[PDB]
Design a protein around this ligand. Sequence first.
Ligand code: HEC
Length: 100
Amino acid sequence: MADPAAGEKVFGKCKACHKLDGNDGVGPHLNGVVGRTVAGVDGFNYSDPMKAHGGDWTPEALQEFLTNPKAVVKGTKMAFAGLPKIEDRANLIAYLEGQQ
Ligand code: HEC
């Protein structure tokens, strides 16, 4: 279910750490994330297992990482448990494709 207006509501879990208006605080800026390199913001202090993992943030890699982030990148500083429903993951990834 690729819906950006419902994905803004699921981004309610992300907005307390991650900033869409080009800014890097507790988490980095999620405006321009789909297709971006893993640890690829020169500006945010990333953990060493995020730099040693590598690749780029595709829809398949994002739905695995938003299911459990400390199981996929083993030793990331992201304190988030998971999005369990496929519907909520497809809604939020459609909003990350709008904020691209
Ligand atoms: C604060 C408690 C966070 C919440 C809630 C969410 N994330 Fe986060 N995110 C946070 C940190 C501290 C980090 C950096 C981890 C590191 O290895 O240094 C991140 C990282 C992500 C990333 C990777 C970003 C990139 O490399 O460009 C993604 C894709 C990410 N987080 C996505 C995301 C989403 C969509 C969330 C809401 C469901 C979410 N994060 C919550 C901190 C926190």
